[PDB]
Amino acid sequence: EFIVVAVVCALFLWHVRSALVAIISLPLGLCIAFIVMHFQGLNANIMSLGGIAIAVGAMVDAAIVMIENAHKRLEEWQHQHPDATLDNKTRWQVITDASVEVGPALFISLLIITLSFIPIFTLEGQEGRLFGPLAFTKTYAMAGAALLAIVVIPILMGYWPLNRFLIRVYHPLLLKVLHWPKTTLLVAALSVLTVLWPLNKVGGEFLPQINEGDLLYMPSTLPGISAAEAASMLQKTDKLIMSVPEVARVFGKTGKAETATDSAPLEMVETTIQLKPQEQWRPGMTMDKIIEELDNTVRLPGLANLWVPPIRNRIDMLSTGIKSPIGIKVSGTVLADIDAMAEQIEEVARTVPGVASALAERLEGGRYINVEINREKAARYGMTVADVQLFVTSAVGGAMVGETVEGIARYPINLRYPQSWRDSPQALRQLPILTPMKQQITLADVADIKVSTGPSMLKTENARPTSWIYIDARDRDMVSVVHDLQKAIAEKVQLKPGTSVAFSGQFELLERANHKLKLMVPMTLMIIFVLLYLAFRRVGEALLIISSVPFALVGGIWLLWWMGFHLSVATGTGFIALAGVAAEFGVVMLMYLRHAIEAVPSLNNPQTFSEQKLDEALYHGAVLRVRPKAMTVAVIIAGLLPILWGTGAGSEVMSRIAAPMIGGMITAPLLSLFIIPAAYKLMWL
Amino acid sequence: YVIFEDGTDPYWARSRVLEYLNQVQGKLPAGVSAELGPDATGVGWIYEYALVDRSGKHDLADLRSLQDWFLKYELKTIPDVAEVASVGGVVKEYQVVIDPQRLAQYGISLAEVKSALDASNQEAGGSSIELAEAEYMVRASGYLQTLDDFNHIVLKASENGVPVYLRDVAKVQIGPEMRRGIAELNGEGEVAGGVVILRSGKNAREVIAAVKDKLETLKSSLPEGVEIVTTYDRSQLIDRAIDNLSGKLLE
Amino acid sequence: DVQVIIKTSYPGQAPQIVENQVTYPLTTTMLSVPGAKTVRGFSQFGDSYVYVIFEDGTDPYWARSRVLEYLNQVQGKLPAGVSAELGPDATGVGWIYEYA
Amino acid sequence: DVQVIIKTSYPGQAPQIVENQVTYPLTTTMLSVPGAKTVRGFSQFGDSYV
């Protein structure tokens, strides 16, 4: 990004030392940002560096503007007086005057950017913790850049073909626009109204699928399997997963590790598949196709396959508890009603075209061998309840009795009967019982043993039983399938008194972030308007240039639709950031145009029917002011194209945040170039 | 009661008292154990109600059990309700009274009766077998459920003879535990009630609103004839004071 | 988020018994801790786990110090041999390195 | 400095037993406390200080 920005600056100014003066603002801004975030206590991660990479161009624009202005002033001075006659005194004077002529506007523009992206600190929770560092570092970098531009840049600027084509292409369009401004504003309104077409096709999700070098495999199955069978299933599924050429290691495991952070019982597979470096396969096999091949290769009837990254999966399980991205919780107080409702919902969900699989957790899926100890019979032989259940807690059981020490180690002891006495319930009814009377009897003479069903594990959220339903959909959108499931389970499934249904997982966080972003726009607009009145001291110009963000939004959403991205929190942040850049471009344009209209033409209008010289002032404000705007737009787009076309680690979020800004910086400036002069001419009359 | 200096964190004090509690626990008697108090104080008694039954049907011992085992748990879930206490009523107690004359005839001492009574209320099964198809968990009964179970336990086994049952030395019955608190309404008679205690440093109006909403939405699940009559409510004073101050400011 | 794990062991007790005598008094007691956002909890044939997740902007150690007090307050009601042990100072996302 | 003392009593146990069963699990556990600079510890015929 730094290299490309330097190249663009050197190609636009065609002066090496000017390019150096322009780019020296980036390293010092980076240094200031790093110092401030070290003082605060942040570390270097994807978000911080992403914020700095996003702020690169927004911090170089203000310096290149002043550099171009000083260039023009020096050129004019040289054109006025003979060459080969100069000294440091007059040069320093003219450079300082040229810098002061345009400093305040760009300073207030950088302040606009900063304090208009500041309102994103209101995010709370997962998205807040994710986007905190980004906003922090972006604000720090922009503040340092503004400080340097208003303090340091003049000093080292005083110490140290293409535009003709732009003018030739701009002249006639500008004239024909100034001829009729009303029709121009009308076609602008229509170009804003034509935004409703892509908004429907753009999807919706919480966050992009940030892919890493590994991925988890956690299938859902019934708890009715043994230990040896579970180990055999693990072995066969691991050997089947290893059959894919993009797998280096496979470490499968069932049950739990010896830690409190793992509560998984047996019958629950959790494998960690390690993928080879992506430089070891055909450059056309993405992660989605690898997941598809894995899903198609390890069918293994009896499992509901699920593939997710480790970090994201564990963060989801921590924040919500549902491993899958989409999930439905059925609450209530009765277990039978909850189980029936979960079964119904699970059976209805797998008919949605986008869903790939759906599985509900059963509550009553546990087999019990109930031994009702009759107290009358147990008393007839003279033995308490404890004495008759010791024959099943220790003989048929094997509970621990103690532990032996060996240096530092310790190992437990067991005690139980042989295996031939726990074969079948009929083998229990024949258990030999040595009564306290030193007698021989069976277990059927003192207790009735039968087989039944009941709860295997009781999950309760907020002290209320709940049943979770895991949904898996990889082909269709997230919000689309969520709305489809809502409609389906609200149409063809009837509720029962005492039970509720709630969508959880990514959808709750998505809705929270959506509400926050929806209520966050007014603050940004108000800050922009305040800082604009602070610079132009008029409400007219403030509203004039603040009415330019809609074009930016239209362009951003169009580019989002064109690139195939979905609407998420990253795109929201992108729009909240693009608003400020659009406002900054409008400020620059209107400031230059205003100086133009202020200098010459304040004399002819008092004589009515005088519009010939009013257009020449606008022309002058669109002949001398064409290079700065083109340069700002070029550097803004060039400092963002790299992170847009980037394909690496963590590039998903940055590309999603950059796409809206690059989309808007092509539509808002191109339209502003014709809407600002038109509306300003209309306002001056 | 340990009262601290001014400007002290309400939680720093508890965290510092826990350490000295641990330090002194090593010196207390065998079975004594010092338990910390709740996160509220005496001034936290925000809301108080009484469970009235104008039908002469539900006895005094049922109202208190209903309170303790339903409302103490339904209201405790409110965000900032530090505690819910029960006042008045009667607690159900299994009283086994022994006759000296009939106890001497059999020649049994009280120690054996106690050891046999307090050794038949365990429930634990710690095995796991396989039925040739899948896992099979192992249970084991042992909980005491009804009264006849108390008369069906044997104290000593007579070799080839009628063993002595608890029904032979001691008779069982239900009774009221020694009452520690008595409550009563206007002039009618004793009544069981509850007391909501708020957490130190939180707003009372929101807690009262939530408590009233829950007690209202629970009015359908209560038995027929039982009603909850409020005896103390602090929201009325809050409303009156706020209205008075607002009117004063306006005038 | 800020999560505290409470793992209790009840040797050989059906899920319902361990849920009535161990998990319920813990899930209903931890909901009164200052700053507790939610309290998940599930009991198995011999164990009971309770996850207390707190609000945003809460000290990771203040939460543990405040959960210890309510753990002590509820310890007097648990069964004879049951004892609730606090969890480690990490969470599920803390699984950094794994070897075989 | 900020010092915390942990005194444990094991009646009548040779230094090695009290060091293996009492002092070692304490010295190795207290080294994970946030902010613990060092953890000294020694066990005697009946006691263990950390």
Author numbering:
A (entry chain A): 345 to 504, 516 to 1040
B (entry chain C): 94 to 344
C (entry chain A): 44 to 143
D (entry chain B): 44 to 93
From the paper:
The Escherichia coli CusA membrane protein, which recognizes and extrudes biocidal Cu(I) and Ag(I) ions, belongs to the heavy-metal efflux (HME) subfamily of RND efflux pumps. Typically, an RND efflux pump works in conjunction with a periplasmic membrane fusion protein and an outer membrane channel to form a functional tripartite protein complex. Extensive classification of the single-particle cryo-EM images of the CusA-Cu(I) complex revealed that there were four distinct populations of the CusA particles with different conformations that coexist in the nanodisc sample. Our data allow us to propose a simple model for the transport mechanism of the CusA HME-RND pump, where the CusA protomers can independently and uncoordinatedly function to export metal ion by progressing from the “binding” state to the “extrusion” state within the transport cycle.
